[PDB]
Structure 1
């Protein structure tokens, strides 16, 4: 018999639909006393092979051992569920993107922003110790969630499954130039993640969406082929300027590791 049955789809209480797009639907719900979010995945040409792969790839995402990583609580196997489905806890503030750019009630201060940066760096350092790496679509402000005590957490629900279309990139502004152009097996994926963190630093400094005026296709082609880069923000400390520049080094090999920037960010805390 199988090692895991996964979560029983019949035990999910679907409360309210949150959104729908190309990749599927997000719902707020309840399961075994937990407030959850459910992703119902939309997959063209679903097959036994893809279902087998989904079920092999989901257990890796159930990471309960680090405060700055948000696990997949579990997944519904399809069959017998109607559709392949992922479950996480509901994070009350939503994504870092929501908190920074759609924050109608208060503006997070820069002490909180530095704490977000440290949280994300700690979670990424931990994920980078895993062997092999867990494939993700990308680190960006939509794949980081903000929990009830404002802890930032890297969402494992951003997993990239072996069947999902590598040809469509929806947040290229956070992607390293080499990763816009080369297959992942031909890049250092850890160094590519550091570029993404550099763009997150830029986002925390400017409180702007990177390249907001451009479409995703414009961003990817201009960053890859025309050298488009975020402009270094004026009026910031030389220390923050220097950190942003080293994390955004054009040479992937010269970018620091996450475990090197954690102590730098620790020192930038108020405590």
Structure 2
């Protein structure tokens, strides 16, 4: 049965509840997060095969119900909470582009590795100290049309979501497509609609969103492209950038 990721439940001290399965902060045998699932192995092979700096790191599993997935602790919760908290009003484009870059990097690794995330959006990004961001957790509004309608999930659909994630970052956590219910979105993105440029955000960054929301999966950029473009941004793209009232 068990593989070398197995640890005994006894080695874990659950302490702070973080959200309700459930997520607890804890101790081993080392501060850790434990995801717990309300009463499986094959579909956990994903997180065990992928080790990288900008992806939340797996530490161990308890493969007996109730199942415990144990990972590194991300001191600042979801990117979505972080954007919506006290920190929101102090964030600007430098910080937000940089966060976007780290995510793109984790993702570009997933790309090399030949995997697909499937649920990429700020709720599944985790923030540590010093604005470290890490991809976690391997719905229509964040989904590419071909995936929402025909099940065609590929790294290209992940790219689509990334483009939506950039509106979350640049609106400091706002739900995409303000005012539309799901049906209206699916109907409208099919008719060709796309979110306009967020207030105070450079046209060049909204242009990058639009390449991500190209109707042809194959024509959307690579994450490796996104990673570099975001890394090089305030030199190669907006050298004249000045801080606004919000970005």
* Mapped contact 2:26–2:33 kept (Cα < 8 A): yes
Is 1:173–2:141 an aligned residue pair?
yes
Distance in 1, matches of 2:56 and 2:150, equals: 29
The two structures, once aligned, show a CA RMSD in angstroms of 2.4
Q: CA 1:213–1:75 in 2, change beyond 3 Å: closer, same or farther?
A: farther
- Residue 55 of structure 1 corresponds to 41
Q: Which residue does 2:176 correspond to in 1?
A: 210
CA contact (8 A) 1:63 1:70 kept: no
Counterparts of 1:93-108 in structure 2 under 5 Å?
Answer: 93-103=76-86, 107-108=90-91
Structure 1, gaps ≥5 residues long: 44-53, 160-170
Q: 1:258 aligns with which of 197, 219, 223?
A: 223
Give the 3-state SS of the residue equivalent to 1:99 in structure 2: helix
Question: Does the CA contact (< 8 Å) of 2:5 and 2:59 recur in 1?
Answer: no
Contact 1:64 1:70 in 2 (8 A): no
CA distance in 2, matches of 1:88, 1:101: 24
Is 1:224 the counterpart of 2:206 in the alignment? no
Distance 1:140 1:37 in 2: 20
Q: Please give the TM-score of this superposition, normalised by the length of structure 2.
A: 0.83
Contact kept in structure 1, 2:22 and 2:35, CA below 8 Å: yes
Aligned match of 1:25: 22
Relative distance call for 1:130 and 1:101 in structure 2 (3 A) is same
- Determine the C-alpha separation between the residues in 1 that align with 2:207 and 2:70: 39
Which runs of at least 4 in structure 1 moved beyond 6 Å after TM superposition?
A: none
Secondary structure of the corresponding residue to residue 17 of structure 1: strand
Note the residue ranges of structure 2 that are not aligned, 5 or more in a row: 237-247
Residue 124 in 1 paired to residue 117 in 2? no
8 Å contact kept, 2:13–2:27: yes
TM-score, normalised relative to structure 1: 0.77
Of 55, 62, 67, the match for 1:69: 55
Q: How far off is 1:145 after superposition?
A: 0.7
Match status 1:40 vs 2:33: no
Contact between 2:78 and 2:122, CA under 8 Å: does it hold in 1? yes
Q: What is the correspondence of 1:85-100 to structure 2 with a 5 Å cutoff?
A: 85-100=68-83
Q: Distance in 1 between matches of 2:49 and 2:162?
A: 21
How far off its partner does 1:55 sit?
A: 2.2
